[PDB]
Design a protein around this ligand. Structure first.
Ligand SMILES: C[C@H](Cn1cnc2c(N)ncnc21)OCP(=O)(O)OP(=O)(O)OP(=O)(O)O
Ligand SMILES: [Mg+2]
Ligand SMILES: [Mg+2]
Lengths: 414, 554
DNA sequence: TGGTCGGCGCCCGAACAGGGACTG
DNA sequence: CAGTCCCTGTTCGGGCGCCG
């Protein structure tokens, strides 16, 4: 109902974002432009000049099966420069209830955010520069007056007036757990979709004529969770065919300290010929099925500390197969999974890796209200080139690019 | 005159003052000019005279303009700049002749004393203070300050550019079907109207600018195709770069090589197959740009080679938004590559090279990807889209390289182009042990304090060997050992290793490396008819492992 | 006499940065 | 454990080209 604007300070000892806008398709410029004009014609934004030293990249994303577009800005650089605002001062508890909750639903409503003026003394930071094809006309700048989507403060403030809008439901439906991240809103329940889905259609009319508007939908990440560390089953065991399962079970030890080697390690000590079939022991063969018994027993030491950063490494296992390991510390993965190519999809590395990076994160949030810093297995330039092409998440997780081959045939392979 | 356009708010760097440096003596030529200019400005009000109350001063001079005969006043605002706030440059890149689309009517027109027409913020004016010295240097110099953007002030550009747009906005807004490639103050005005309606409209633009304080003097190419634009010549149906003279000499210096390679680089956009790997390699020895470097045969060719390509006159065509966008690449040799973009067989839109040696261990396919990449990019910066490719690599060479590579890699809609030299892998390591193959057990160590080391192996045939090492590393060793196990092995082998370093290097299927050793390692792997390579956790009692490590030890 | 500024391209060097193997 | 080394990347800045 728009009166009050909350002062926001940039975490002292710092400065603002100054990230260059990168190349965009002609479908995207004609996009942002048709957007950024309406957005100004209704004062959410205002042109600005070169006397403003700040910039944050932007772009569009045609929504899945949705013909209409949707602007988007890589504020990752700002949010990291305004955390104490929405961290220390305006923290967040632990909505564990949605984790176990049968069926959840993501509902984006950041669209509301625009009906709330933004601290003027701040706006100068929401600056983004639209570009031009072949560089005809110089960059067209802008700035925010309201609350910019994708900003972390944006929700952090609206958080109040939100809760309120939600009481005519939250209390009259305590069962259904409701969460809010960035621009998205989560509706975790424990009923059937024959209802849960219809219950969302109710939370719609509630939020609709209350002021807000909302544009395999549902989720139940628990009905998946971590995965095994599966071992090979043979009737014969060559020199290497063993020297392998040995090396693997060597690293698999740092994660599980309860695995044994000796019995399966003594099966040979001479410069034997790699292919010499040698199934060779009573206790060693017993040991195998033992170390095999540990890979059924979910590890120990995993303590989720919300006061540190979640990482995530991934693997390319051919045929739409991608394996990951959500973890905060070395060898203590608070979660690990595998992603398989969706039905009908084609074979495209990035197109996939992204989708992966997303689901991985979608989960991550509904499981820690945070996002993990992916350590991608692709080439910067390659990533940086097409990714944007395939994204769809109103947010954007941190990320780095790394290169390291699979020598222990990945504890996770298949 | 000066335009009404509102000025742009500019502060100094928090807690800082203005310039305060004097004026170095100038020839009696410059001064003779700097005055004749100022008189004109002052009278026009482009700068007011200042007195004692202005405690500031920065140095000036004049450089001659293109055509010459006229002078350009410039102020050494170096200091002021450092002392001024920051600005968000708004000139993202550069337009490309190959980006212009066909138009029925084109004209161009620079703007008179551009900078000196846009109002400069009331307050800031203080600092822009400067002084015009005299001849005999006896009588004090005349002291002034600017009212309009000074030439050479850290912000002028962004402000002029920003300003202009706003100024053109109304006109553009009311005549959408007219395009205007604005570059700083130079204006490219095309449209698809007849000489009538067009020249009619052109005038409107012109008065509008003048109305807003902008001058379009007769230095506006009308029915002057070839229009001169950005360093090119715009013909009705094709364009080109302007004269691109190279420096013809005997005693070469680092500077020269630099102005050479650079000049060639400018060409590389239209004259196909230029190359510089060799010439610019001649600039690895960081030294004085005055220091005489020795031209090498190796490169002596590269010069004269390219020097020939430039003899042939060449041109490019423009863009048609209807026909598709093709890009085809070829391998010029040493990791270099040359591509040309187009839509019509021998109607090249643009041409480009690519010689970035990324990494220390790569292959042709690796590079041939980072090419597609570089191309994809600019092709969007120019046409706002992604070109279909024509790749000298087999639909299968690739099919293999990715389904088998650990990392993710992608390449847009492409199609094979049979035309050597074609691209391809030179050896695919066995994914299984080769039966009846002297399974080797390699390793090698080195003492980091004496820089000495040993490298060797063993086999399922007991066959034993080892070699001493100089300055080697804990790394150079493992390799050095894998190096021999090859020459000491026939067509089919089977080496086993503990070291990841070398395993990974190999699995990359490199065929290019600055690493001497790695070369042979590859070359050898190419001669062999099959090779399997496995890994085993080093320093943990393991068959065959022990002995090898055991053997080589210090 | 050679001295300014903003954009982008290219080459190169240097300063970082992060793992893995060692040592102490 | 640390304190190292190797080796691999990234970044940033310098010089030149071209444009205004
Ligand atoms: C000066 C400005 C761009 N420019 C061109 N050269 C410089 C330079 N050395 N420093 C700063 N700016 C520069 O305008 C382009 P230019 O057209 O070259 O000069 P002008 O001010 O427009 O005056 P005229 O039309 O009579 O030639
Ligand atoms: Mg001009
Ligand atoms: Mg070793």
């Amino acid at each position: 109902s728009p009166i009050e604007t909350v002062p926001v300070k940039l975490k002292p000892g710092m400065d603002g974002p100054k990230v260059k806008q990168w190349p965009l398709t002609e479908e995207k410029i004609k996009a942002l432009v048709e957007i950024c004009t309406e957005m100004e014609k209704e004062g959410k934004i205002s042109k600005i000049g070169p006397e403003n030293p700040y910039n944050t990249p932007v772009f569009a994303i045609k929504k899945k099966d949705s013909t209409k577009w949707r602007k988007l800005v890589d504020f990752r650089e700002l949010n990291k420069r305004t955390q104490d605002f929405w961290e220390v001062q305006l923290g967040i508890p632990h909505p564990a209830g949605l984790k176990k909750k049968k069926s959840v639903t993501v509902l984006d409503v950041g669209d509301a955010y625009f009906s709330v003026p933004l601290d003027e003394d701040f706006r100068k930071y929401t600056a983004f520069t639209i570009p031009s094809i072949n560089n005809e006309t110089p960059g067209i700048r802008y700035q925010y007056n309201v609350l910019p989507q994708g900003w972390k403060g944006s929700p952090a403030i609206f958080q109040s007036s939100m809760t309120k809008i939600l009481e005519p439901f939250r209390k009259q439906n305590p069962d259904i757990v409701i969460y809010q991240y960035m621009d998205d809103l989560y509706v975790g329940s424990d009923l059937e979709i024959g209802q849960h889905r219809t219950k969302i259609e109710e939370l719609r009319q509630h939020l609709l004529r209350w002021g807000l508007t909302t544009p395999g939908y549902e989720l139940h990440p628990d009905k998946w969770t971590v995965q095994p560390i599966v071992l090979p089953e043979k009737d014969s065991w060559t020199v290497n065919d063993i020297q392998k399962l040995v090396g693997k079970l060597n690293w698999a030890s740092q994660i599980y300290p309860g695995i044994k080697v000796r019995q399966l390690s003594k099966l040979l000590r001479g410069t034997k010929a790699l292919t010499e079939v040698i199934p060779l022991t009573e206790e060693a063969e017993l040991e195998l099925a033992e170390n095999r018994e540990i890979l059924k027993e979910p590890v120990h030491g995993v303590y989720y500390d919300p006061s540190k950063d979640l990482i995530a490494e991934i693997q390319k296992q051919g045929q739409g197969q991608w394996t990951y390991q959500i973890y905060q510390e070395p060898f203590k993965n608070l979660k690990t999974g595998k992603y398989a190519r969706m039905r009908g999809a084609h074979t495209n590395d990035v197109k996939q890796l992204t989708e992966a990076v997303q689901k991985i994160t979608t989960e991550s949030i509904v499981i820690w209200g945070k996002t993990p810093k992916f350590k991608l297995p692709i080439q910067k330039e390659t990533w940086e080139t097409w990714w944007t092409e395939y994204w769809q998440a109103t947010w954007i997780p941190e990320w780095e690019f790394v290169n390291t081959p699979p020598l222990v045939k990945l504890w996770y392979q298949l | 005159p000066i335009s009404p356009i509102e000025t742009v708010p500019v502060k100094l760097k928090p807690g800082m003052d203005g310039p305060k440096v004097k004026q170095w003596p100038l020839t009696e030529e410059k001064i003779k000019a700097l005055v004749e200019i100022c008189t004109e400005m002052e009278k026009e009000g482009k700068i007011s005279k200042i007195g004692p109350e202005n405690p500031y001063n920065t140095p000036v001079f004049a450089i001659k303009k293109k055509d010459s005969t006229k002078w350009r006043k410039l102020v050494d605002f170096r200091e002021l700049n450092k002392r001024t706030q920051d600005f968000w440059e708004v000139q993202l890149g550069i337009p490309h002749p190959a980006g212009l689309k066909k138009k029925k009517s084109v004209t161009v027109l620079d703007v008179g004393d551009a900078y000196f027409s846009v109002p400069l913020d009331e307050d800031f004016r203080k600092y822009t203070a400067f002084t015009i010295p005299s001849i005999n240097n006896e009588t004090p110099g005349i002291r002034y300050q600017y009212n309009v953007l000074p030439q050479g002030w850290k912000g002028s550009p962004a402000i002029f550019q920003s300003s202009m747009t706003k100024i053109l906005e109304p006109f553009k807004k009311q005549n959408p079907d007219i395009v205007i490639y604005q570059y700083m103050d130079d204006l490219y005005v095309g449209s698809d109207l007849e000489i009538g309606q067009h020249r009619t409209k052109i005038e409107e633009l012109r008065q509008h600018l003048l109305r807003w304080g902008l001058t379009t003097p007769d230095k506006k190419h009308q029915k002057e195709p070839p229009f001169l634009w950005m360093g090119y010549e715009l013909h009705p149906d094709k364009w080109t770069v302007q004269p691109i003279v190279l420096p013809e000499k005997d005693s070469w210096t680092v500077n020269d090589i630099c102005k050479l390679v650079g000049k060639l680089n400018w060409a590389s956009q239209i004259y196909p197959g230029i190359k510089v790997r060799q010439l610019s390699k001649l600039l690895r020895g960081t030294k004085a740009l005055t220091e005489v470097i020795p031209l090498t045969e190796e490169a002596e060719l590269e010069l004269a080679e390219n020097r020939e390509i430039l003899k042939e006159p060449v041109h490019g065509v423009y863009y048609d938004p209807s026909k598709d966008l093709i890009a085809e690449i070829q391998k010029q040799g040493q990791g270099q590559w040359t591509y040309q973009i187009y839509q019509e067989p021998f109607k090249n839109l643009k041409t480009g090279k690519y010689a970035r040696m990324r990494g220390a261990h790569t292959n042709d396919v690796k590079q041939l990807t980072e090419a597609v990449q570089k191309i994809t990019t600019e092709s969007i910066v120019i046409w706002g889209k992604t070109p279909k490719f024509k790749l000298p690599i087999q639909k299968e060479t690739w099919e293999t390289w990715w389904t088998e590579y650990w990392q993710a890699t992608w390449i847009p809609e492409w199609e094979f182009v049979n035309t050597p030299p074609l691209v391809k892998l030179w050896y695919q390591l066995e994914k299984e042990p080769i039966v009846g193959a002297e399974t080797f057990y390699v390793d090698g160590a080195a003492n980091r304090e004496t820089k000495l080391g040993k490298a060797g192996y063993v086999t399922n045939k007991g066959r034993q060997k080892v070699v001493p090492l100089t300055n080697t590393t804990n790394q150079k060793t493992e390799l050095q050992a894998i190096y021999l196990a090859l020459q000491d092995s026939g067509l089919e082998v089977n080496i086993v290793t503990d070291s990841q370093y070398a395993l990974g290097i190999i699995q990359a299927q490199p065929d290019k490396s600055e690493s001497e050793l790695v070369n042979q390692i590859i070359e050898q792997l190419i001669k062999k008819e099959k090779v399997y390579l496995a890994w085993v956790p080093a320093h943990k009692g393991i068959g065959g492992n022990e002995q090898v490590d055991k053997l080589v030890s210090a």
